[PDB]
Structures are given as C-alpha cells and as structure tokens.
Amino acid sequence: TPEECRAQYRLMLKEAMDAYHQLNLGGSVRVVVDQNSERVEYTAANRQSLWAYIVRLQNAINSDNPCAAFMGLPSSPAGFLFP
C-alpha cells in the first residue's frame, strides 16, 4: 500500500541520513567489542552508495507510488525532443 511504503521509506531515510552524518564525521561503526568479550565487525559504509540510497528513498517518498519508484525496475532510456 502506497503510504505504508512511504512511511517505511521515511523511517529508512531517517536512519540513512543519520548514518551519512556519522559517516562523514567519522562516527560510523565498523567494529564493536563488548566487555562480554564478544565482537562484531561490519562491512564499511560507502559515502557514494549511501548518498545514492538516500536519493532513491527521497525520490520514492516524493513519488505517488513509492514501492515502484524505489526499485525503478521498468526503466526506459531517455529520449530527446529537438527544437
């Protein structure tokens, strides 16, 4: 359903923009260790791909049918109109 998906993507966008903030500042986590002696390593975030994901999300939110505009699956090439 359109607006349920739009809210999904709004929450995901919140998380992604916070991640982008922390990433450019150098606060994006790549390793965590607890005093429990248990460890977690993460695949490093990439600024380009994360910005692009943010743009997908914002565009879907802007669109009438977010769940379709996110994937962009039925793409078609841009034609040109000449004067």
């Binding site: 606060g27 965590v32 005093q35 248990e38 977690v40």
Partner: protein, 120 residues
C-alpha cells in the same frame, strides 16, 4: 553521552541473529511449552563432584550457560524460572535438555544469561 548503548545493542542483536540456535522452553510443571526459541549455548567441559578432596569419584559435567534475547522472551510470553528446561531442537544437538539454575545479573541492553545444568 554517546550512542554506544545502541551500538552495543545492535552488536549483541547481530551476534545472536548469527550464532543463535533454535530451542524449546518447557517449564518445570510442563504446563506450558514455547517452541522455536533462539538461544546461544555455551558449554565448557568440567570434572566435578568430589567433596573437598576426599578421594571421591568425579563426574564429567559442563560449566554451561544459555544466552537469551529479552525481547523474544517478552514477545513469546516466556517467564524463565529456576527448574525450567531448555531443549535444543536443532539437528545434531541430541535434544539436550538444559535446566535453568540461576540467572546472571543483567548487564546490558539486549541479552540475559542463565547458568544451566545438563540433564538429558
């Protein structure tokens, strides 16, 4: 001050989502049953049972503890108590039955650790 409390939580959540195994909760009275629980089973071999050092026979038993997620226990309606049993339904764990003995103090945001005893 910092976001470490959330980082730690997500870390523990991912550790569980990766290393957990399915289990079944059977309460002491066996009145209630809760299947498809996710627990982490920590087992270390121990040789115990000799009073002082009197020369009595030891038995081989484990020093073992089970990690739960608290969110799951609340979700599934599980009130863990002494005497309650955890059965490891994963294939190849021989349906090991683990008797909850006493709980470790909750330190941290995601998990609760119970010291248990193998019973079979």
């Amino acid at each position: 001050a910092s976001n470490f409390a959330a980082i730690k939580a997500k870390a523990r959540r991912d550790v569980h989502a990766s290393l957990s195994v399915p289990a079944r909760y059977e309460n002491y009275s066996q009145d209630v049953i809760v299947e498809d629980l996710s627990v982490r089973w920590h087992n270390k071999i121990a040789i115990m049972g000799d009073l002082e050092n009197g020369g009595y026979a030891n038995i081989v038993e484990g020093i073992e503890r089970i990690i739960f997620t608290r969110e799951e226990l609340a979700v599934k309606g599980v009130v863990l108590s002494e005497g309650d049993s955890i059965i490891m339904t994963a294939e190849g764990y021989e349906n090991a039955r683990l008797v909850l003995k006493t709980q470790e103090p909750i330190v941290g945001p995601v998990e609760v650790v119970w010291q248990v005893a193998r019973a079979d």
